[model samples]
Target: KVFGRCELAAAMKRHGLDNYRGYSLGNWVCAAKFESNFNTQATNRNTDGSTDYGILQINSRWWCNDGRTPGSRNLCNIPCSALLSSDITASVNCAKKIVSDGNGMNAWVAWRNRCKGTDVQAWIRGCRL
Candidate 1:
């Protein structure tokens, strides 16, 4: 496990994820909520023989190697398992790289479908951080 709603927002802010590269903190908070429900060990299998890893739910098809997704790009040069851990540096860093690669926050389906065009400040209501 990683954090609750408020704790996740605070941790993301402390890690320089707020307003990073033109994407908003609220955007990521909402995406995380739907993607992994703030769990570090979260993993979901995709129908396309790929998988989404960890809090950010980075795809195994292009971002990391899981040994199951054949011919994966592994652009972040990290294993898919690395994203599922207590420390979020690897996952966050890979997410940053994913956004930097012109995907922006659109790489995350949850961001586009859930966070976008929505009021997300509620994600940080009680953390006071």
Candidate 2:
């Protein structure tokens, strides 16, 4: 399912993205926007043959197991399929885990390219918590 911007923000808040690990809700909102455009089914294959999955674009090479990424750490210990769900519970959790593991939001290229060091509050504006 594709989530509306505000809807995705609220859903992320419900899953504890707000103010998580010193990052604001807007940061997460922006990351989701650029990463998957709020599409729960989004996936991107890397040049290295690693696949990123779901809204937060959890990577198969490090986080989730897809059985295709060679030498995967599977740090999240979840199947990559779990991230493709609209529910987002696992996706949000994996995102949080990614942040908590010292990578911060920079694990996502979209976050670095578009969301970092910017005024992302607009992404969550009018989205009442």
Candidate 3:
């Protein structure tokens, strides 16, 4: 339940994310809220033979393992169980990479614009690099 800022900072630095403290905490929280309800272990098995897992709902078969098995390295190295671990900072950082990936946050923002009144993706996209 406690967010670890140190771990999050380390994760962000590893993924080349800048301006951590200046970022919108509320938007990030909301994104996690809408996506998996902050459930890091959440996974979805789609009808099209696809699967999304982890905090950001990362597609295990697609982005994680080329539409095959979800590799542990892919999930661990990038964002998966590690992101959702007890380390709050690390979790946020892991989510940050997905958000800054150009496609990830944009998807969230698009969804937010339609459903909520906030555009988290645009905020991240416009963050001072």
Candidate 4:
């Protein structure tokens, strides 16, 4: 990941995600940590036939498309590979929409278990937001 801690928050702010729609920047940061440790190239598949893509791990079945993936609804009209970028704008946008469409950041199982109730503010610790 090109960003470190608050740099991500700063970028998130610049991308219109800074405190947008009530969820704090720290919330996103915390989710990113659990999603892929802020690595944009990260990708993973579940035993249940789902894939997590990008820093936020937006599922291939729900948020992004893989063309060959059977369960893909492509709600974001984006490819799963598109999420794997050093530039996270697209991934963040998809993640924002996912959250907006559901129960806040809890849309991610990673965030639910790891980021939920954690000291999210400290997620930006050490960098200048």
Highest TM-score against the true fold, candidate: 2
| TM-score for candidate 2, residues paired by index | 0.96
> Model 2, range 8-83, lDDT digits (tens) per residue?
9899999899999989999998999998999999999999999999998889999999999897789988999999
Clashing pairs in 2: none
Per-residue accuracy of model 1 over 1-129 as CA lDDT, tens digit each = 767788888788888889899877888788899999999899999999999999999999999999999877899999999999888888889988998988688888888898888887777666667
lDDT over C-alpha atoms for residue 69 of model 3: 54
Q: What does candidate 1 score on TM?
A: 0.94
RMSD of each: 1.1, 0.8, 7.2, 1.4
Residue 1 lDDT, candidate 2, scale 0-100: 87
Per-model lDDT: 0.87, 0.91, 0.48, 0.81
- Candidate 4 lDDT over 1-129, as tens digits, reads 646777777888788876877878888888887788878888899776778888888887778888766866888888888899888888978877887895887788888898788788887677676
TM-scores of the candidates are: 0.94, 0.96, 0.50, 0.91
Runs with alpha carbons beyond 4 Å of true place in candidate 4: none
Largest lDDT belongs to which candidate?
Answer: 2
lDDT preference between candidates 2 and 3, better one: 2
Which residue pairs clash in candidate 4? none
* Model 3 per-residue lDDT tens digits across residues 35-119: 5565666667756665665545565443455335533335335443444454445445555555555564554542355334566
Tell me model 3's lDDT, rounded to 2 decimals. Answer: 0.48
